[PDB]
Amino acid sequence: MNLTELKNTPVSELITLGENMGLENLARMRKQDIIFAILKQHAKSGEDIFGDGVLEILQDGFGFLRSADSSYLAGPDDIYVSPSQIRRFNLRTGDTISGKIRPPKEGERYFALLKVNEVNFDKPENARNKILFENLTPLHANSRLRMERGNDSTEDLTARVLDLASPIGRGQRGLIVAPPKAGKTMLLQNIAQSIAYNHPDCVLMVLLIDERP
């Protein structure tokens, strides 16, 4: 019924859910196609379907609601939004759109957004009055982020050394100079553990380029 919870389910459970519903031959196909097939069959019952994701705008003018679970990969389960809805609600690439999605009619291969009731975890009307990021005035970092972890008390001293060598604050634009085979990967992992522990409120996002599966 809900798009976000369906993708988080294991693939093994996903096949079992579709078998009892009435679908067949869902085992030997990609997980993205299974989700589209299950939603298509469930749409015939007439029950409302909820969907959410990150909205992007193409060069033609129309956009799609990508999902962060699949690393924003194009798929048949992506939600299509008409350019008309963009005029009603000022949306740009990056924002999160959540709302009901209608079954795709004949001739279209993507679900269409029916009504949006949540924009950036906020009321859509309130999101329309937000100021753009480029008009904001930047400043120097002033909020200290305690990278040291006391409760864990692990044998690794990377967190303790990082605070002494170079303290990290909110809004920093630092870079790491790491030669190959110098523990670069584990360095980021240790930082991520402290951020998720010392500052749970802060949103942590990890982006990796050209990394092994």
Added chain:
Amino acid sequence: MNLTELKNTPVSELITLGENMGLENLARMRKQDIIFAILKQHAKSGEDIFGDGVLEILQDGFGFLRSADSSYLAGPDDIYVSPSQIRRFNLRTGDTISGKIRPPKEGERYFALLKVNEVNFDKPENARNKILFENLTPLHANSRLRMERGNDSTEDLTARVLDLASPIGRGQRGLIVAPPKAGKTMLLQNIAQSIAYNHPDCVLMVLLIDERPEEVTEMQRLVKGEVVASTFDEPASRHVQVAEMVIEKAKRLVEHKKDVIILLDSITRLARAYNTVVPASGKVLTGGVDANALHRPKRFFGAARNVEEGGSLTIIATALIDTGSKMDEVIYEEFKGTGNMELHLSRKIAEKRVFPAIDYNRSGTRKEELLTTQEELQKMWILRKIIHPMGEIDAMEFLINKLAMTKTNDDFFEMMKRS
């Protein structure tokens, strides 16, 4: 009566079998045509004929059941399957299909599958519920593969050095950097012997691209497993066709909780055929290699994964450098950081008649903690500390003499503890 056993028979015996049956003039023709002729004559008797092979699907929609014995080469003896049977049983390129085959009627030149009773060495109904390979979650290698052989006790120390230089596990995506005339061919052969000996359960597949016909025959005799190769005289499209056949077959076996090890030779040769086959996009980069041309080798090489649910796919490839070509250099650069274990060979070491010509300092592996044990890992670190100050050439003869007078690697490890 059975297709698989008929192809394994010697060609000399194949002629004799057809002569007494009633056929004539089978001596001066290709072996593939003889098999088709014998099956055609035997089909007149009405006896059932059993056939098996690797199934592939063409772009039109119909498929053929290629045989791994002939390196998946198209022939008159290939089994044809109607697209209707594909709907009944979900089949994709790579899977093995075994069952009865009916005689070809007039108007068709290929045998047709009548009833399938074995899919991927399993019941066809059970194979329909297998989870796709792309949906599996990859993980780091954790199953240590002991490359050292104790019973053989041969004078070659390549197996002993390989474990010390870079341990190899299940699901590794390592590559070998081998200059020309640096013992690259024998390096793969030694690895194949240990895999067929230490881990008989693991499926070993060897794929060779642009290799001489005499080199392919030697590989089949030496390697105790499935060996498929494409000769240089064959077109570049043939190289692409066989390359996709091996990986697709491996993926299907991995879905059945099986471990597949693939010895690739070579990525540079494989990328050479891929670049030619793909049509030009109107833009040419440096070295005459398009960006989309190398996309296909990346898919093939990146498929080496360790399945959390069960099974693993290990791919070991070879990279050619200092060959006097630029294309081969550009290909190597994009395939540097894609591997889990690097094994770099040095031509200068081979010039000193010291084997194996392996650069210990340059070679290495990632996440070696999972493969080796706590005690074994510390010993390797101590050895690397001594080797690092020494040069890339002096390190080998230093290591060779130490391993020469020791029985196993454990005896060598305790000797270094004395110093």
Added chain:
Amino acid sequence: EEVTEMQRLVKGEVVASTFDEPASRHVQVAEMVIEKAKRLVEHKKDVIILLDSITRLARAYNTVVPASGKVLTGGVDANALHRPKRFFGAARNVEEGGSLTIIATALIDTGSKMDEVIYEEFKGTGNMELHLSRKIAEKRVFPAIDYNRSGTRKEELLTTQEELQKMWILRKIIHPMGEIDAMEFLINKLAMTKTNDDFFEMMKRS
């Protein structure tokens, strides 16, 4: 022998004229069929006429009509082809009730210029065109129908909203393919499907 086979196979009223009969006989029977059909249409009945062939029918009409003193290209007078136009154009859908459906066959590439001139004047007169290809028949693939060339007008009224969209999707895939490769592509898909509905839902997968 062709007339006898048609009578045995077709479950209906079959009338035909042999080649040995004079051209005036062909004209007499042609007017008989259409006049009979028109009377039945007036009684709120539906009549379907399978015509074979317009080129053969125009051949007899040209000979029967006396010469007007002027000969056009191909030896066919302007008034000579007036009669086939009346016969072919009578296919109408009556608003009050009933309809008259006329399906005819046109011969092309027969080695005669006259048969080409007749076809040219009868191009834009039809509601649906069905063009056959000899090359497809040479490949032993049947029916030898040119899908790209074939078409119909006002297909919205005949088919439904759901059925019409499925046909448009199929035509989009077929159009890039050649006139010959489209048939064997379509034949295998229809061979393994029971009905057209099963074929339609299969194309939706792609």
